[PDB]
Amino acid sequence: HWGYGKHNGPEHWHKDFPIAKGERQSPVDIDTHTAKYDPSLKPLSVSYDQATSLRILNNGHAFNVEFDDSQDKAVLKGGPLDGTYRLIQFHFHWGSLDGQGSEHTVDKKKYAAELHLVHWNTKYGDFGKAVQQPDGLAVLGIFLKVGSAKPGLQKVVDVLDSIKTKGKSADFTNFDPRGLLPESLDYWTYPGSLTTPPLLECVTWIVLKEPISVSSEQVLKFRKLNFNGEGEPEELMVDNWRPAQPLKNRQIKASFK
Numbered sequence: 001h002w003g004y005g006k007h008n009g010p011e012h013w014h015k016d017f018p019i020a021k022g023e024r025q026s027p028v029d030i031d032t033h034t035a036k037y038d039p040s041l042k043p044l045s046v047s048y049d050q051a052t053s054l055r056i057l058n059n060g061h062a063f064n065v066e067f068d069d070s071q072d073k074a075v076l077k078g079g080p081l082d083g084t085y086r087l088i089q090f091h092f093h094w095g096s097l098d099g100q101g102s103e104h105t106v107d108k109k110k111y112a113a114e115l116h117l118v119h120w121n122t123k124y125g126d127f128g129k130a131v132q133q134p135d136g137l138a139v140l141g142i143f144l145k146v147g148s149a150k151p152g153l154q155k156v157v158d159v160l161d162s163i164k165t166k167g168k169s170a171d172f173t174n175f176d177p178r179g180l181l182p183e184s185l186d187y188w189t190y191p192g193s194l195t196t197p198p199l200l201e202c203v204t205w206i207v208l209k210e211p212i213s214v215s216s217e218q219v220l221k222f223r224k225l226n227f228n229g230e231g232e233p234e235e236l237m238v239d240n241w242r243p244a245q246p247l248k249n250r251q252i253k254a255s256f257k
């Protein structure tokens, strides 16, 4: 099955998932000098006050913080989006060292990690139907650099010991994702895909320009997770990122001048 290693990683995914070579794959490099300001783009409306987190899961690839998406409790709208997109989960991608880990790059710069807040378009009723649509998903991407600690991340860091291996989960109620945002909501946007199999081309990507800072100790704890299950040889969960893919016939738009 797919993963991030030499024999099952991104260079192999196309065999089982031929859309890996498709026309709107993610991530991409954001070439900042050619991303054109679009004055018709609206401010992003992130409404997370009523978010209800439920659980955190090590799925063998990353960890997902899952939300109650049976009502419009945490939603993303505005920006490039038409309608309303409901938060279902967030997760991260990160590196073995601070100089890599992000999926998107900015003028070829790799950040230490990247946070993805995943939302589905409520006009399709359920996530499974949304991922059959070219405008089914909106993913808010936020870069992480290593510096000062992010206070709102520490509750995540501290539960990771309890979900070390694939298939382990823990209660994770009352987590406020507002604590993971940067100050500015300036963004770049483009049409793309999921960055892991099944690589479905359903995503409006919204990538924030301002990184959040996390401490070295915080990211070091991400790197103590395991890809393997309990009682299997230890494979540290590091370098769970897909490299940049060809931009093809797409334009990245900037929300800011």
Ligand SMILES: NS(=O)(=O)c1ccc(NCc2ccco2)c([N+](=O)[O-])c1
Pocket (backbone or CB within 6 Å): 089, 116, 118, 131, 139, 193, 194, 195, 196, 197, 198
């Ligand atoms: N790195 S990402 O934000 O693009 C991403 C990748 C895969 C999946 N899911 C994979 C999957 C299984 C069935 C359909 O879809 C998700 N997600 O679900 O939020 C997000």
Ligand code: NA
Pocket (backbone or CB within 6 Å): 034, 035, 036, 251, 252
């Ligand atoms: Na452009």
Ligand SMILES: [Zn+2]
Pocket (backbone or CB within 6 Å): 091, 092, 093, 116, 195
């Ligand atoms: Zn992701």
